[PDB]
Amino acid sequence: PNITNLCPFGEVFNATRFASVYAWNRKRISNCVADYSVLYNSASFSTFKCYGVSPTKLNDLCFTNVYADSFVIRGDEVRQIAPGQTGKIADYNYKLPDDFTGCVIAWNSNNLDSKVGGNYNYRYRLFRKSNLKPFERDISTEIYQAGSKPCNGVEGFNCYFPLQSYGFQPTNGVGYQPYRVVVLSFELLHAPATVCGPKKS
């Protein structure tokens, strides 16, 4: 063994542009050797929480595929991304199952996303009829209804647009600074395992 076909983590953590939270990007990783030590041994990550397995032991066992979900949220909303949590993000945008196994990484990106006049590209859902199922993505832009009369399109009294934008500014304090979040999930279907670390020698 010579350790080849490295998994492309650079294309995920160092992507030029990220997607909105209501349209989070999902990437499938398989059939490659992955090195999580280079990720864990980095001081650039503000939050690194592993639930299913301990980070050090992760280099031994291996699965049949991995899924990376990437998006951008606010600073105060990182705590909502965890099993058994509630909130706007955890209900209408991104929900994790209670039996989740994997890891969550979140780092500040104030110097990139924020703009002097205000960055309004990122959006999120504010209203929804019912809570989301785990790993379910909803991108519909139907006009919301809260009252009793049905509204034909245009916003009325109780008819609001379900999507609202973010107002990132250079000077907002750590509470409101943008944060980039990547969630790694390991899935272990009946197919033979293919994604695990180098045979050290």
């Binding site: 205000g118 504010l126 809260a146 109780n158 609202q164 000077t171 907002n172 304090g173 750590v174 509470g175």
Partner: protein, 596 residues
């Protein structure tokens, strides 16, 4: 789904989009204030009205929800703020006239000028000058001249403007389901929610003079002592029976008696406490002052302040053409942004002002988690009291010696303590009767108890028993004396300053009790006590979410506003004054006048 869910959805939609617009308006205001230029003027306006242009529609939309069926107290309280018709209830042709009359009144007050008749080509303004003449001078004739001139060239044209202003504002008051404008002002001290904590608007009237009567024995002795000292200063001008005139106090309106400290110093052989030269010797800059003002709050237990406050705040000395108006302020721009603005210098006064603004910033940071419409103090009197507590507690000799400014071998004695106590009393307790009398007169004039003719005589007769001030020269009906005041011509409520003192003293007494201190209250300190910090934080974090009666239950043990801590603070001074004026008699005669 009832209307209660619709209200929640509407509020959730509203506050999210209100936050950004408010932040933009605050940013524009800060940009103008830090950098005074024409280019940065219109921008403020271009934001300002727009913010208002957004606040009106949401106020218009908060009427289809019938706020009598909503059961959640928080939601109802949050919605009550939006349902304020304000001046929109008046007709447009009257609203424009009201705006015009306020603008012209403000301009007239701000453009006062007096020329000495010998030199009619050089008038002075209320800026340093005439005010300096009235404050720092020793001459009866020129003081009387300045007083009469200012009340005769500003107090004459304001009578019809104020006459129309009163009736127009009163019609607005009936338009807003109030029988008087006094009720509109007193509405902030009103709660009708939790049982046992209810407080009505009318109760404040009976509650003010109930707690004012206990202060009269303390005020009478001060009046007698000041009158005796003025007699020993001014010969054959102040009778020992009557009360002192208006223009000898040391201020244009007599709001404060600080300027009189030079004449009425008890025994000035020993020097006063000053460490400014010590600060200069140790080479203290603005950073050192603002870091020593932060270590105190850290030691108490309050959280450390965020990064970026040191980067964005204009701490000191704009310097060149980059000018700035730097009345000391603490700015809460929203979205987790806090700043300060000051032209700091190396002086103990700037040290105390820095502590005051630091307390303001801490209180602002305390309730950042509340919704947008609940980010304020419980009432208008809590914020300044919280600010002034730190100033009171950061000037004791023990705290000064702890940070090593005073000499470690300093011994205090009778006279310096008594002198400092009297110096503080000349400012704190010497202004309560003036505020009480002014607010009482304004309440009655809005209620219409005194008719139009009974204006200038009722004011001056009441001032005699309430305050103890006589007429220098009579005014019959053609003057408007109260109009020559900032808080009377600019439409500002004046009852805040009366409650601020009692609130601050109650808070200080409660903290010192729960800080394990022994001795007189005025020497107490709240440093290195984490339980006191926790006790204060438990109330600071509430914001406007709870009634102020409940807020006055975690710091102190009684919801009512009493005066016992005030009397307990000035106990040594009172017991010295008891034996001080053993030959004179306390109290004044209301009939003696300088002219007749």
């Amino acid at each position: 789904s009832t209307i209660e869910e619709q209200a929640k959805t509407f509020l959730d939609k509203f506050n999210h989009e209100a936050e950004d617009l408010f932040y933009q308006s605050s940013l524009a205001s800060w940009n103008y204030n830090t950098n005074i230029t024409e280019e940065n003027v219109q921008n403020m306006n271009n934001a300002g009205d727009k913010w208002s242009a957004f606040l009106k529609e949401q106020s218009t939309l908060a009427q289809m929800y019938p706020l009598q069926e909503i059961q959640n107290l928080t939601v109802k309280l949050q919605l009550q703020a939006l349902q304020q018709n304000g001046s929109s209830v008046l007709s447009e042709d009257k609203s424009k006239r009201l705006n015009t009359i306020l603008n012209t009144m403000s301009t007239i007050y701000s453009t006062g000028k007096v020329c000495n008749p010998d030199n009619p080509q050089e008038c002075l303004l209320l800026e340093p000058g005439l005010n300096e003449i009235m404050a720092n001078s020793l001459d009866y004739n020129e003081r009387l001249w300045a007083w009469e001139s200012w009340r005769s060239e500003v107090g004459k044209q304001l009578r019809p403007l104020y006459e129309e202003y009163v009736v127009l504002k009163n019609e607005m008051a009936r338009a807003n389901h109030y029988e008087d404008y006094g009720d509109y002002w007193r509405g902030d001290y009103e709660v009708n929610g939790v049982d046992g904590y209810d407080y009505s608007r009318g109760q404040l009237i009976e509650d003010v003079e109930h707690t004012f009567e206990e202060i009269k024995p303390l005020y009478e002795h001060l009046h007698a002592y000041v009158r005796a000292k003025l007699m020993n200063a001014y010969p054959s001008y102040i009778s020992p029976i009557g009360c002192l005139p208006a223009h000898l106090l040391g201020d244009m309106w007599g709001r404060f008696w600080t300027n009189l400290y030079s004449l009425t110093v008890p025994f000035g052989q020993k020097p006063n406490i000053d460490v400014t030269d010590a600060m200069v010797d140790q080479a203290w800059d603005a950073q050192r002052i603002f870091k020593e003002a932060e270590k105190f709050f850290v030691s108490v237990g309050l959280p450390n302040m965020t990064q970026g406050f040191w980067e964005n705040s204009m701490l000191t000395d704009p310097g060149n053409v980059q000018k700035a108006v730097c009345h000391p302020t603490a700015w809460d721009l929203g979205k987790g942004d806090f700043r300060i603005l000051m032209c700091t210098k190396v002086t103990m006064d700037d040290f105390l002002t820095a502590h005051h603004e630091m307390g303001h910033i801490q209180y602002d940071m305390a309730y950042a988690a509340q919704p947008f419409l609940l980010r304020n103090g419980a009432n208008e009197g809590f914020h300044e009291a919280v600010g002034e507590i730190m100033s009171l507690s950061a000037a004791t000799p023990k705290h000064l010696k702890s940070i090593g400014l005073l000499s470690p071998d300093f011994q205090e004695d009778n006279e310096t303590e008594i002198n400092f106590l009297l110096k503080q009393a000349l400012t704190i307790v010497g202004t309560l009767p003036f505020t009480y009398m002014l607010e009482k007169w304004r309440w009655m004039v809005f209620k219409g108890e005194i008719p139009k003719d009974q204006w200038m005589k009722k004011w001056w007769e009441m001032k005699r028993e309430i305050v103890g001030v006589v007429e220098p020269v009579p005014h019959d009906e053609t003057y408007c004396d109260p109009a020559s005041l900032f808080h009377v011509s600019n439409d500002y409520s004046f009852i805040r300053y009366y409650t601020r003192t009692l609130y601050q003293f109650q808070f200080q007494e409660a903290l010192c009790q729960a800080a394990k201190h022994e001795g007189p209250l005025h020497k107490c300190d709240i440093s290195n006590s984490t339980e006191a910090g926790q006790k204060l934080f438990n109330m600071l974090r509430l914001g406007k979410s709870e009634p102020w009666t409940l807020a006055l239950e975690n710091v102190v043990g009684a919801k009512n506003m009493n005066v016992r801590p005030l009397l307990n603070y000035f106990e040594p001074l009172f017991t010295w004054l008891k034996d001080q004026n053993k030959n004179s008699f306390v109290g004044w005669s209301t009939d003696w006048s300088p002219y007749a």
